[PDB]
Enzyme design. Structure first.
Site, PDB file in Angstrom:
ATOM      1  N   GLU A  10      -0.202   5.822  10.817  1.00 57.76           N
ATOM      2  CA  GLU A  10       0.871   5.085  10.163  1.00 57.76           C
ATOM      3  C   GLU A  10       2.178   5.351  10.901  1.00 57.76           C
ATOM      4  O   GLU A  10       2.232   6.150  11.835  1.00 57.76           O
ATOM      5  CB  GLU A  10       0.980   5.462   8.681  1.00 57.76           C
ATOM      6  CG  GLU A  10       1.416   6.893   8.421  1.00 57.76           C
ATOM      7  CD  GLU A  10       1.944   7.091   7.018  1.00 57.76           C
ATOM      8  OE1 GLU A  10       2.304   8.235   6.676  1.00 57.76           O
ATOM      9  OE2 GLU A  10       2.003   6.103   6.257  1.00 57.76           O
ATOM     10  N   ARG A  11       3.244   4.681  10.467  1.00 57.71           N
ATOM     11  CA  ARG A  11       4.519   4.778  11.167  1.00 57.71           C
ATOM     12  C   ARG A  11       5.020   6.213  11.179  1.00 57.71           C
ATOM     13  O   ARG A  11       4.877   6.947  10.201  1.00 57.71           O
ATOM     14  CB  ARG A  11       5.568   3.892  10.506  1.00 57.71           C
ATOM     15  CG  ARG A  11       5.190   2.448  10.323  1.00 57.71           C
ATOM     16  CD  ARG A  11       6.263   1.755   9.515  1.00 57.71           C
ATOM     17  NE  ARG A  11       6.033   0.329   9.346  1.00 57.71           N
ATOM     18  CZ  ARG A  11       5.066  -0.190   8.603  1.00 57.71           C
ATOM     19  NH1 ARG A  11       4.223   0.599   7.957  1.00 57.71           N
ATOM     20  NH2 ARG A  11       4.940  -1.503   8.502  1.00 57.71           N
ATOM     21  N   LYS A  59       0.822  -1.204   0.000  1.00 57.14           N
ATOM     22  CA  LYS A  59       0.000   0.000   0.000  1.00 57.14           C
ATOM     23  C   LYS A  59       0.857   1.256   0.000  1.00 57.14           C
ATOM     24  O   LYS A  59       0.658   2.153  -0.821  1.00 57.14           O
ATOM     25  CB  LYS A  59      -0.921   0.005   1.214  1.00 57.14           C
ATOM     26  CG  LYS A  59      -2.094  -0.921   1.112  1.00 57.14           C
ATOM     27  CD  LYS A  59      -3.125  -0.581   2.154  1.00 57.14           C
ATOM     28  CE  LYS A  59      -2.553  -0.625   3.548  1.00 57.14           C
ATOM     29  NZ  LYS A  59      -1.879  -1.908   3.825  1.00 57.14           N
TER      30      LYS A  59
HETATM   31  N1  LIG Z   1       7.409  -2.213  -6.501  1.00 58.15           N
HETATM   32  C1  LIG Z   1       7.841  -3.083  -5.563  1.00 58.15           C
HETATM   33  N2  LIG Z   1       8.958  -3.814  -5.743  1.00 58.15           N
HETATM   34  C2  LIG Z   1       9.404  -4.683  -4.819  1.00 58.15           C
HETATM   35  N3  LIG Z   1       8.776  -4.890  -3.655  1.00 58.15           N
HETATM   36  C3  LIG Z   1       7.641  -4.227  -3.348  1.00 58.15           C
HETATM   37  C4  LIG Z   1       7.103  -3.260  -4.303  1.00 58.15           C
HETATM   38  N4  LIG Z   1       5.994  -2.751  -3.753  1.00 58.15           N
HETATM   39  C5  LIG Z   1       5.837  -3.335  -2.541  1.00 58.15           C
HETATM   40  N5  LIG Z   1       6.824  -4.207  -2.300  1.00 58.15           N
HETATM   41  C6  LIG Z   1       6.945  -5.027  -1.076  1.00 58.15           C
HETATM   42  O1  LIG Z   1       6.096  -4.475  -0.071  1.00 58.15           O
HETATM   43  C7  LIG Z   1       6.793  -4.347   1.162  1.00 58.15           C
HETATM   44  C8  LIG Z   1       6.433  -3.046   1.854  1.00 58.15           C
HETATM   45  O2  LIG Z   1       5.078  -3.101   2.259  1.00 58.15           O
HETATM   46  P1  LIG Z   1       4.290  -1.763   2.635  1.00 58.15           P
HETATM   47  O3  LIG Z   1       3.381  -1.411   1.497  1.00 58.15           O
HETATM   48  O4  LIG Z   1       5.265  -0.753   3.163  1.00 58.15           O
HETATM   49  O5  LIG Z   1       3.380  -2.278   3.846  1.00 58.15           O
HETATM   50  P2  LIG Z   1       1.897  -1.723   4.068  1.00 58.15           P
HETATM   51  O6  LIG Z   1       1.062  -2.566   3.148  1.00 58.15           O
HETATM   52  O7  LIG Z   1       1.654  -1.950   5.535  1.00 58.15           O
HETATM   53  O8  LIG Z   1       2.001  -0.282   3.665  1.00 58.15           O
HETATM   54  C9  LIG Z   1       8.258  -4.376   0.810  1.00 58.15           C
HETATM   55  O9  LIG Z   1       8.991  -5.097   1.800  1.00 58.15           O
HETATM   56  C10 LIG Z   1       8.365  -5.012  -0.546  1.00 58.15           C
HETATM   57  O10 LIG Z   1       8.888  -6.340  -0.457  1.00 58.15           O
HETATM   58 MG   LIG Z   2       2.267   1.334   5.095  1.00 57.86          MG
END
Ligand SMILES: Nc1ncnc2c1ncn2[C@@H]1O[C@H](COP(=O)(O)OP(=O)(O)O)[C@@H](O)[C@H]1O
Ligand SMILES: [Mg+2]
Ligand SMILES: Nc1ncnc2c1ncn2[C@@H]1O[C@H](COP(=O)(O)OP(=O)(O)OP(=O)(O)O)[C@@H](O)[C@H]1O
Ligand SMILES: Nc1ncnc2c1ncn2[C@@H]1O[C@H](COP(=O)(O)OP(=O)(O)O)[C@@H](O)[C@H]1O
Ligand SMILES: [Mg+2]
Lengths: 127, 467, 477, 188, 467
Positions: free
Chosen positions: E180-181, E154
């Protein structure tokens, strides 16, 4: 908070000193009746699971003994019981007849014959 | 102190103390009762009223009955005179052999040993059983889960453990039956009398039974584990020895706790268990430990509801277990006894740092060869025995010999096997399995290993049956 | 009786006393009962006060006298706690004397804002090859360790703690890490054995242990993480580095669910209240990395979660995955098979520590990660090569227990592995080769490892000398 | 049960039930005025700081509270009705809402003697002649024998006019409401 | 006015005013605190008491403390001087750069636009993401929602959208980070400072930041979405401009409500949720519309509890969005990134009269082939891919090629993986999917499409694979 015996009728009785002509040890007055559960005021000397007898000929088992009231479960339809009725102790926990006089007889939960073959012998009783 | 019963809702009794309130967990005796009725306090509702869970049937109680405050929690008679005596949760004997005469009484609500009354080094409890001591050693002062529990030898195994522990290390044992069927309770009493772990004549018993019957109110089946812990804690602390504590069943402990919590009027947690499930289990399981004086090794029989290992009950009990034994119907069929599943059994101390490198290597080799034989059995069933190599037929033979050697004759089963029971020390077991793995006995017949003690007995059996 | 600074327990039961009085008691203030326990006043109600007892409710009775201490719930903090075990309220339980601390910090103090923080730029060395090469952890990061029953998570935590001794024995005050270990709802036997293990590794002189074992009332297990986090915030705000290991954060959630249900609060999903996410984010938002205008200190956090049957999409695991800066998924299948640590490098990631990794480890671990990733997708010629190299690396990342490695040895071993020197060695002997090679380099060629460590990179001359060492040793093996 | 005589105005709650019990008890035996006077007396008697401090502490046993209240009632020579009411409130632990019971009985007795509370709100105060004609007309609203209980608040929030409450009847000749009405209808 | 605290339970405080009562939503100031504690009124309880929600930590509040009515709801500073700043729930700067100097304040509790103000225009917003642009084309001025469990992408996706859309955006922008963080907010702040989108030493900042991050009580997380809504509403209505409004994570706005609802004495709904879930969501989400006075292109990240799209919160949010984008954990486990589920994602402008006929036809062909593959998957998993007709094998191959091709390397993930970020104009996306669908690339290996930009890069990758 609130109690079920704090209804204004009991308080009215107690304010003008009318609570001394009523025997609240072996008799009680139904506070509520509904869905087969009666809540009775009095019966201070009634034991848990003892059988009480309502004024209208019904029986009941006193299950919930709370500080204010007694929760009796009625052994039949609560059509005949009305708020204000009089409930008397029977004195004994529920028991049933026993013996070889029951063999071949259809009885209900309390040992009363329901097959219309006549009274039930019943020399002995058992809790 | 004297109070009055003000309310009676099922197994819950609300009492009123005009003079002074008893602390929580105390025991109150109802005066005017044909048989002793004890109520354990659980709440302070205010207005000098307390709410108590009844340990016996509350039927026939009246609003106003006098209740006498004992002043201390349920106190049971503990000592050496409880050995061989059945007694219910409140300590009254129920085997009709007279009073349990003792000079000691112990309250069943005690606290876990402090952080300094704790052994800092792991240990091993040598039960004298090959499979248990090799593939799943029992840590001293650690909970052991025991699975199966249906016509697979649970009772005979319990009795053999009692006998071995009272013979090798000399410690006594307690058998707390939480929610025990009366039929099976009497059957167990008589089995113990027959095998000899209980002696009604000479007072040389090795086990003290505590039965929480299955028809006692929920407030009694929830506390019998604590009565057993008290009887065992006497032997640990006062007698300074290692005790065994068999809790059968632990799921019934959790169920009784849940029922009590619901009756008191508390919102259920995840799957309808008490909101205090984790702490209700922890307060008990934390008194089964290795103090610096003695130790208590517990053996819970465990039941897994719906065969679900993630149900809150076993999910919470498994957090405490320090080992596992899995009796299997599939192995009692083969005539192997004890029918302990060698591969499904587990232990936390099966670690080279604890059990030593040689023990660990022998155990790992036995597990690997048994897994290899299990895998090969599919090939045998499908492609036929001919398909095997010569470095696989050898493993099949070695694994069959190991399976035979893992069986043992129990001293409390000499009327089932015609042999004489063996209590194999640990070194004998490790050496025997090390030799079998090495291949030193590849020339013997498989049946020469069935139901024997140390390896030398296998040699003697081979000589006696071949000559 | 003074009905302002003192009250009387109206009703005890469930571990939530109702007191009558304390008219001047602040919300969340700590009060002391007559018996000796302590409580926290949650519900300032018009007619009473709801005090949760930090102890056993058996000791409290209706009528007892509650006296307000006058301060919000706080714990003693400082250097005086290092080497000591303490309960959730900072009272020592190892019987080595009074704690004797000068400063007291609130357990409910708020986390630093957005300006104090700064990106994570320093590495937190764990001495575990898999963790240090594939999922590096920086200083100030929050790296969840999520697994199952008996899969080796406490082992990761204790290897980290024991490894910090290389730095806590040196002189550089900018590398010393003071560890904290919070044990929640965990057997006291395990805590005692763990403390002995630390004392045997000379790892208590810089370690605090907070205990809320399973025999401790629910409020203590609820409050232990916050006591530990304050004990670590002390170091964070004083320009020193700290590392706190909540273990587990699922036992704390169970304790809080008990506390909430006994208070008759509306159960939600899996009967957990609605505050569980807030309960944990309030806690893990304190593991910050302050900027040099605030001291430059840091507080790493290594929360531990025990999934149930490998379910990572549960409620509490997903909350803490939405709170933390990464994951270390320990797989039970791998652990039982024989891979240990059982880190499932496929699903384990590090949001932040990637930039904090050390250059010398960074360059080698980059190609290690590419090779393992390629191997993961194929499990002829190129396929056979990838399988061989991947199996070599996987058997290379297996590790012992309580034997952490310095970064230089990890660099040497992984360099030997990834540059294809072991591509001929039989896959079973990789561990034996590794153990022999480590002894070889640790005995004779200290100059090379020291130069790598000091320069913080595998320079071309260092690369050549390492090449010579590994090829010669492989020849003599 | 005893067919209690219902009060004119139904008060609800714990105080309502206790007050209705008292009113039914007094209405028979015809002791409403004396019992109301005794209730007003106990309104101050219990309010004494010593007695209030000794009756709001739930750690003095109900026995001691009942004994103290019996002593006070004897020392004050009350009707048996009021003494029994105080005893009943003490046994049930309902002393903390005794003033609520007195207030309920006051409201219940006021309607018994035929009173309809009234409220008048205006931007500014009134001249006594205008208040006199207001008294007259409002008495015109009431029925026979229904005394009036006028209250004249002054609300400057309204821009003028008058607002009158007579029981549940309400008439709003205030400038503010008419401004609102025109502004809204005109806005449509 | 002046009232006194009477009760303090969690974040819910009861205040008694003997004089005039404050209306609802009106804010009060607790007099006697080190910092500013604002209590937003929420109910009138009778007896001249009001229940209120505290916008900050309530520790240290004493019963009887004094509370001063403020006369108006929480009023925040709005204007062009809130660009480049960081605000909190009550409008206080938290960037340590001086008071936000504006001549005009806005109450955060305004009402939604009436019906005669809505705009019916429907354009297409190109984001440079293949999956988003082909199947669920985002629309300018509409609401967009990124649904996804924990750790599926996300925030990475929303940062990619920030980068792309708000670099090519001449209008203003507003990021409201609710629940969020905090380190994520810090990273965003510094990325904008570096990227020129914020000038700390000029007046050319184009992003206003609001932050109610997870460390703050429920009362602050509940009412921090409204602060961002107000800051954006100003730039829409008054400045008459086109605004971008990013919210991350909006679930934490409803979640926070269920934290205070419990304490407000309200009967809980389906799963512990407040009874007023949909009404609160509606009143918040109907202020983010694009009216005739301006335009707001709001992108909201929505968290799906326990990956459950049947949950009341995401299920209710679905009805408030034009385009949705359901990130899936399974697809993310396959390595595809962004993990957008092509079949759950939808859009209002996926209409042949808006996107075209080649775009529409290609999108529907991709969806049809993916749905056929999903239908086959269950059999493929057990019986194996050998029990398939040749048309079915062709469908499986094309579907896997398309699944891989929808994956794209973002620039915000340059640090993660070391690849190079790629933007894929709409025409290139449509052409590449046309070619894959027609079968022009059936001779390539499916792993030649994994993480590439336009299709010609896939062809180059396939050629490199041959070497
Ligand atoms: N374009 C991308 N390329 C590689 N990994 C991705 C990409 N988009 C998301 N990720 C994966 O999503 C993880 C981050 O999740 P994040 O979206 O920050 O968590 P949340 O869903 O809680 O926001 C990363 O560790 C990565 O492995
Ligand atoms: Mg997030
Ligand atoms: N690196 C390793 N190498 C070999 N064995 C290991 C390793 N790590 C852990 N183990 C084994 O796993 C067992 C459990 O380890 P550990 O206590 O770390 O898991 P845990 O998740 O903490 O257990 P629990 O969940 O019961 O607290 C230990 O007895 C140890 O022998
Ligand atoms: N060591 C053994 N030798 C012979 N028979 C055994 C042995 N262990 C268990 N059994 C057999 O297992 C059966 C079940 O025994 P037991 O465990 O006492 O009953 P339950 O399993 O119902 O508790 C017995 O009939 C007994 O013959
Ligand atoms: Mg552990």
């Amino acid at each position: 908070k609130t109690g079920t015996a704090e209804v204004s009728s009991i308080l009215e009785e107690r304010i003008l000193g009318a609570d001394t002509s009523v025997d609240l040890e072996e008799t009680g007055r139904v506070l509520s009746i509904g869905d087969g559960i009666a809540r009775v005021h009095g019966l201070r000397n009634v034991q848990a699971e003892e059988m009480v007898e309502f004024s209208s000929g019904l029986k009941g088992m006193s299950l919930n003994l709370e500080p204010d009231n007694v929760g009796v479960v009625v052994f039949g339809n609560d059509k005949l019981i009305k708020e204000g009725d009089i409930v008397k102790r029977t004195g004994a926990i529920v028991d049933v007849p026993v013996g070889e006089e029951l063999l071949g007889r259809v009885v209900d939960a309390l040992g009363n014959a329901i097959d219309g073959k006549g009274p039930i012998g019943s020399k002995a009783r058992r809790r | 102190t004297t109070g009055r019963i003000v309310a009676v809702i099922g197994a819950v009794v609300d009492v009123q103390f005009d003079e002074g309130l008893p602390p929580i967990l105390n025991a109150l005796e109802v005066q005017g009762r044909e048989t002793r009725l004890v109520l354990e306090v659980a709440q302070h509702l205010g207005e000098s009223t307390v709410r108590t869970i009844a340990m016996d049937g509350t039927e026939g109680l009246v609003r106003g009955q006098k209740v006498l405050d004992s002043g201390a929690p349920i106190r049971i008679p503990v000592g050496p005179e409880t050995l061989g005596r059945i007694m219910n949760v409140i300590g009254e004997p129920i085997d009709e052999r007279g009073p349990i005469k003792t000079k000691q009484f112990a309250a069943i609500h005690a606290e876990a040993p402090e952080f300094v009354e704790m052994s800092v080094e792991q240990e091993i409890l040598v039960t004298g059983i090959k499979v248990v001591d090799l593939l799943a050693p029992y840590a001293k002062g650690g909970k052991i889960g025991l699975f199966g529990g249906a016509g697979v030898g649970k009772t005979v195994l319990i009795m053999e453990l009692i006998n071995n522990v009272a013979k090798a290390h000399g410690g006594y044992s307690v058998f707390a039956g939480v929610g025990e069927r009366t039929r099976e309770g009497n059957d167990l009493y008589h089995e113990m009398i027959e095998s000899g772990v209980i002696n009604l004549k000479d007072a040389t018993s090795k086990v003290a039974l505590v039965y929480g019957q299955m028809n006692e109110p929920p407030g009694a089946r929830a506390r019998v584990a604590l009565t057993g812990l008290t009887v065992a804690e006497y032997f640990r602390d006062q007698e300074g020895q290692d005790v065994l504590l068999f809790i059968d069943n632990i799921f019934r402990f959790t169920q009784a706790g849940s029922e009590v919590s619901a009756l008191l009027g508390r919102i259920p947690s995840a799957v309808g268990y008490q909101p205090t499930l984790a702490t209700d289990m922890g307060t008990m399981q934390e008194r089964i430990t290795t103090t610096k004086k003695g130790s208590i090794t517990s053996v819970q029989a465990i039941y897994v509801p719906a065969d679900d290992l993630t149900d809150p009950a076993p999910a919470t009990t498994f957090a405490h277990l320090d080992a596992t034994t899995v009796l299997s119907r599939a192995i009692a069929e083969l005539g192997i006894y004890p029918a302990v599943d060698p591969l499904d059994s587990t232990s936390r101390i099966m670690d080279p740092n604890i059990v030593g490198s040689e023990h660990y290597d022998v155990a790992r080799g036995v597990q690997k060869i048994l897994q290899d034989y299990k895998s090969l059995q599919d090939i045998i069933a499908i492609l036929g025995m001919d398909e095997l190599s010569e470095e696989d037929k050898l493993t099949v033979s070695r694994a069959r010999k190991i399976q035979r050697f893992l069986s043992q004759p129990f001293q409390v089963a000499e009327v089932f096997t015609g042999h004489l029971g063996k209590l194999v020390p640990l070194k004998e077991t490790i050496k025997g399995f090390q030799q079998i793995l090495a291949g030193e006995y590849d020339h013997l017949p498989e049946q020469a290993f069935y139901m024997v003690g140390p390896i030398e007995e296998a040699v003697a059996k081979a000589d006696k049956l071949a000559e | 009786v003074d009905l302002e600074e003192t009250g009387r327990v109206l009703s005890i039961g469930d571990g939530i006393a109702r007191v009558h009085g304390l008219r001047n008691v602040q919300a969340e203030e700590m009060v002391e009962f007559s018996s000796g326990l302590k409580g926290m006043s949650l519900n300032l109600e018009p007619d009473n006060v709801g005090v949760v007892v930090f102890g056993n409710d058996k000791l409290i009775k209706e009528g007892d006298i509650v006296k307000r201490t006058g301060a919000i719930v706080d714990v003693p903090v400082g250097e005086e706690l290092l080497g000591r075990v303490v309960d959730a309220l900072g009272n020592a339980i190892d019987g080595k004397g009074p704690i004797g601390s000068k400063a007291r910090r609130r357990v409910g103090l708020k986390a630093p804002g957005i300006i104090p923080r700064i990106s994570v730029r320093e590495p937190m060395q764990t001495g575990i090859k898999a963790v240090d090469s594939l999922v590096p952890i920086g200083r100030g990061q929050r790296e969840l360790i999520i697994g199952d029953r008996q899969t080796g998570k406490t082992s990761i935590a204790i290897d980290t703690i024991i490894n910090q001794k290389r730095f806590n024995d040196g002189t550089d005050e900018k590398k010393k890490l003071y560890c904290i270990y919070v044990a929640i709802g965990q057997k006291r036997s395990t805590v005692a054995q763990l403390v002995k293990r630390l004392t045997d590794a000379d790892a208590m002189k810089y370690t605090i242990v907070v205990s809320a074992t399973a025999s401790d009332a629910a409020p203590l297990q609820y409050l232990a993480p916050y006591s530990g986090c304050s004990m670590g915030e002390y170091f964070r705000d004083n320009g020193k580095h700290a590392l706190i290991i909540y273990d587990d954060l699922s036992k704390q959630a169970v304790a809080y669910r008990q506390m909430s249900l006994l208070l008759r609060r509306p159960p939600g999903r899996e009967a957990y209240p609605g505050d569980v996410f807030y309960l944990h984010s309030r806690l893990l938002e304190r593991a910050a990395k302050m900027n040099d205008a605030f001291g430059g200190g840091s507080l790493t956090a290594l929360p531990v979660i025990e999934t149930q049957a490998g379910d990572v999409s549960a409620y509490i695991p997903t909350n803490v995955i939405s709170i933390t800066d990464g994951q270390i998924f320990l797989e039970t299948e791998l652990f039982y098979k024989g891979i240990r640590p059982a880190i499932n490098v496929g699903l384990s990631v590090s949001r932040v520590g990637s930039a904090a990794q050390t250059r010398a480890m960074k360059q080698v671990a980059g190609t290690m990660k590419l090779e393992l990733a390629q191997y993961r997708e194929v499990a002829d010629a190129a396929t056979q090569q990838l399988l061989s190299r991947g199996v070599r690396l996987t058997e290379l990342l297996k590790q012992g227990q309580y034997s952490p490695m310095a970064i230089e040895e990890q660099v040497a071993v992984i360099y030997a592995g990834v540059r294809g020197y072991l591509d001929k060695l039989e896959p079973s002997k990789i561990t034996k080769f590794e153990n022999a090679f480590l002894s070889h380099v640790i005995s004779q060629h200290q100059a090379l490892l020291s130069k790598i460590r000091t320069d913080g990179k595998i320079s071309e001359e260092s690369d050549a000398k390492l090449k010579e060492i590994v090829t010669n040793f492989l020849a003599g093996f | 049960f005893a067919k209690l005589v219902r009060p004119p105005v139904q008060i609800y709650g714990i105080e309502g039930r206790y007050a209705t019990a008292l009113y039914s008890a007094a209405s028979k035996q015809n002791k409403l005025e004396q019992v109301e006077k005794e209730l007003l007396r106990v309104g101050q008697i219990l309010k004494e700081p010593k007695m209030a401090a000794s009756l709001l502490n739930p750690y003095v046993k109900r026995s001691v509270k009942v004994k103290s209240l019996s002593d006070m009632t004897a020392k004050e020579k009350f009707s048996p009705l009021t003494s029994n009411l105080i005893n009943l409130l003490a046994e049930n632990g309902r002393l903390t809402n005794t003033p609520a019971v007195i207030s309920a009985f006051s409201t219940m007795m006021s309607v018994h003697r035929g009173e309809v509370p009234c409220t008048v709100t205006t931007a500014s105060a009134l001249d006594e002649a205008t208040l006199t004609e207001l008294k007259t007309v409002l008495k015109s609203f009431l029925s026979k024998g229904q005394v009036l209980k006028l209250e004249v608040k002054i609300d400057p929030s309204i821009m003028g006019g008058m607002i009158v409450r007579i029981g549940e009847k309400y008439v709003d000749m205030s400038a503010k409401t008419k401004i609102q009405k025109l502004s809204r209808a005109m806005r449509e």
